[PDB]
Structure 1
Amino acid sequence: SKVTTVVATPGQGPDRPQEVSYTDTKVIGNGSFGVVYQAKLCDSGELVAIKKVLQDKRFKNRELQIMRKLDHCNIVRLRYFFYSSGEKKDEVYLNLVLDYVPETVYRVARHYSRAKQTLPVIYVKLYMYQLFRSLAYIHSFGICHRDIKPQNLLLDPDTAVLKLCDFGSAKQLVRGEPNVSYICSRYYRAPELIFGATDYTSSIDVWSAGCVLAELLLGQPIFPGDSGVDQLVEIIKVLGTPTREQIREMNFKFPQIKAHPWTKVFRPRTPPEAIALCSRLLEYTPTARLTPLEACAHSFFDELRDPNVKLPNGRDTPALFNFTTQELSSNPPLATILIPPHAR
């Protein structure tokens, strides 16, 4: 087959480029951002995904700057990056060489959905815990993801490892500076984003994470809608009509619906700790939502802290407990809960 050789910069190291050669190139992905290729590195034989984007040249790439800062077992690794022009008007492209990961939570959820099965609660636990860890970490640097949705949660089905990807909307949120309210994909947008607020916090990611939890339990999206009006009605149908207090803390012709009791929303064989968790992730008032770390520590995740827990495929669980000081900074006293007696 054909071989490409580029001079590429490692993501973690100090700016010291080396000759990286790769082969078996194929398209996998399209969209606003640009294209994603898959390839095999010639030296290692490891598979990589290459996200090719257009570069301003005017300003430096915010995705690239944020990803160089990040090192976490539950976030896709940037191995290298390199520039190519190919054949556009002296147009320049930034190529991000990332880890290849052979599945996504979107693809998996949909296999169980179009089989009228429900994803076994154990996986729901493994995947939602590793997401909340990845948020705990990036929230500690004040970085908000702003795009949290199933398509952006990579899985290795053999190791049960989840890896957060797609930092193209990610931004550090400084209290008092405003931010655009038109980020986050439809279905997972926080009510304050729908109401057009520009003084929102990292809590938008917690609401999005809650919408992923509900969807893995129900086997389909919980707040669907082609418009915001449609979206708000599906929310008010579950949380009821926000009070004057609650509206004021988000950002006015609202129908009076009594709150549908939470236990009546999910199928009946659904664990009540999974429901408690939802009620505490999907709150109208952003400041009343759990923190990523507060979530990791919820009784819903207790099975993962059992010393005998094993994967359905018979392998051990992946890293769940190797917390850093950084990751715990939000609230260190929780370490006594997050790190169980048996853990190294």
Structure 2
Amino acid sequence: SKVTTVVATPGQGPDRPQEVSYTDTKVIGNGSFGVVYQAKLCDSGELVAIKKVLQDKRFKNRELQIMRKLDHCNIVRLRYFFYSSKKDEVYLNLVLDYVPETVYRVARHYSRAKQTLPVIYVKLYMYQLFRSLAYIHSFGICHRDIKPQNLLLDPDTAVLKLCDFGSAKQLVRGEPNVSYICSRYYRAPELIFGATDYTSSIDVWSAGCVLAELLLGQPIFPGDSGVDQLVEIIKVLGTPTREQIREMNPEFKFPQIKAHPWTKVFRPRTPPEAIALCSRLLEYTPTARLTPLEACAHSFFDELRDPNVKLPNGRDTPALFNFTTQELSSNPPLATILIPPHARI
């Protein structure tokens, strides 16, 4: 069909634009900040995603600037970017790697089939999500919108890639940040309470909500309003001590409810390690939550470090131990756990 040719700038390396042609354009999803398309590169035949957002000439696009700096196996790669044109309006086009599925779509499949995602996949997906967070957090960048829809999945290789950096921002201690980011169901308590001094740990809470959801087969803290969502949290974590509330946001009345034993939250067959990890991610006190790197090192992921592990389709697991110094910067000693004896010999 129609062949579109543009002069695009490579995502990484020096700003040296090159002519790029693509075709077979289709809509993948319509988001508030723009539309995402699927296209095929005439050159290689590779499929790519093109995120198109309205861009005003007076100020640089933050998502673009953040993506040009990222380079990690568990984060969607920015291949190129370019501008296009009703008319007086200019659009920034982000050419990203295209990934077939999302955790949202896959989980929905199981949910509908009255089944739950096999735990091996929960381990694979969550471990990789934590690696992506360890990486961006090492640069002080907080995603701020971790949710199933932003977790891309390749069904064949079991590779997970974090996407949509439209809400991402470098968090600088002392500088206020809007509390209205992050999607409902996945918002950390401090955000619901209106904190503007939150840290990257809000990504860890969101991650914990995703893990819980994959184990449960449905969101763990649903609610149409903040109040409702907080009630669901309280029912599991128990009523927050005024100390913990202080930890979240430096004035409401909540029902005094005693913590619900995490073991009774999930079905009987739920692995003990999964429940334990959840409880260490979903904590009221932000600073008490595990860091992404610490989560990766958790016992729940031990099976991934077993030399004989294989994917259900018979293929070998994706790369899981190619850690860089940057990625391990928050706690280098964890390398002795994260990189097993058999890895990268």
- TM-score, normalising length: structure 2: 0.98
* Counterparts of 1:141 and 1:259, CA distance in 2: 35
- Cα RMSD over matched residues? 0.6
Deviation of 1:36 after TM superposition, in Å, equals 1.0
* Counterparts of 1:284 and 1:36, CA distance in 2: 35
Structure 1 unaligned runs (5+)?
A: none
Deviation of 1:56 after TM superposition, in Å, equals 1.7
Deviation of 1:29 after TM superposition, in Å, equals 1.2
* Counterparts of 1:236 and 1:127, CA distance in 2: 27
Deviation of 1:176 after TM superposition, in Å, equals 0.2
* Counterparts of 1:260 and 1:179, CA distance in 2: 32
Structure 2 unaligned runs (5+)?
A: none
- TM-score, normalising length: structure 1: 0.99
Residues 121-159 of structure 1, C-alpha deviations (whole Å, 9 max, x = no match): 000000000000000000000000000000000000000
Residues 8-36 of structure 1, C-alpha deviations (whole Å, 9 max, x = no match): 00001200000001111111211211111
Equivalent position SS for 2:95 = strand
Equivalent position SS for 1:274 = helix
Equivalent position SS for 1:168 = coil
* Counterparts of 1:266 and 1:79, CA distance in 2: 41
Equivalent position SS for 2:204 = helix
* Counterparts of 1:28 and 1:317, CA distance in 2: 27
Residues 163-183 of structure 1, C-alpha deviations (whole Å, 9 max, x = no match): 000000000000000000000
Equivalent position SS for 2:31 = coil
Residues 16-60 of structure 1, C-alpha deviations (whole Å, 9 max, x = no match): 000001111111211211111111101101011100001121110
* Counterparts of 2:199 and 2:39, CA distance in 1: 37
227-236 vs 25-34, which moves further = 25-34
Aligned residue in 2 for 1:194: 192
Aligned residue in 2 for 1:243: 241
* Counterparts of 2:280 and 2:319, CA distance in 1: 26
Equivalent position SS for 2:326 = helix
* Counterparts of 2:172 and 2:164, CA distance in 1: 21
Residues 222-263 of structure 1, C-alpha deviations (whole Å, 9 max, x = no match): 000000000000000001100111111111211110111110
Residues 92-123 of structure 1, C-alpha deviations (whole Å, 9 max, x = no match): 00000001111000000000000111100000
Equivalent position SS for 1:74 = coil
Aligned residue in 2 for 1:260: 260
Q: Once superposed, which parts of structure 1, at least 4 consecutive aligned residues long, lie more than 3 Å away?
A: none
Identical-pair percentage: 100
* Counterparts of 1:180 and 1:2, CA distance in 2: 42
* Counterparts of 1:57 and 1:99, CA distance in 2: 26
* Counterparts of 1:236 and 1:281, CA distance in 2: 15
Aligned residue in 2 for 1:274: 274
Residues 183-221 of structure 1, C-alpha deviations (whole Å, 9 max, x = no match): 000000000000000000000000000000000000000
Aligned residue in 1 for 2:94: 96
* Counterparts of 1:333 and 1:144, CA distance in 2: 23
Equivalent position SS for 1:66 = helix
* Counterparts of 1:254 and 1:28, CA distance in 2: 42
* Counterparts of 1:66 and 1:312, CA distance in 2: 35
Equivalent position SS for 2:39 = strand
Residues 258-296 of structure 1, C-alpha deviations (whole Å, 9 max, x = no match): 111110110000000000000000000000000000000
* Counterparts of 2:231 and 2:112, CA distance in 1: 26
Does residue 51 of structure 2 align to residue 17 of structure 1? no
Equivalent position SS for 2:6 = strand
Deviation of 1:89 after TM superposition, in Å, equals 4.5
Does residue 176 of structure 2 align to residue 163 of structure 1? no
Equivalent position SS for 1:30 = strand
Equivalent position SS for 2:327 = helix
- Give the 5 Å matches for 1:176-191: 176-191=174-189
Aligned residue in 1 for 2:63: 63
Residues 299-335 of structure 1, C-alpha deviations (whole Å, 9 max, x = no match): 0000000000000000000000000000000000000
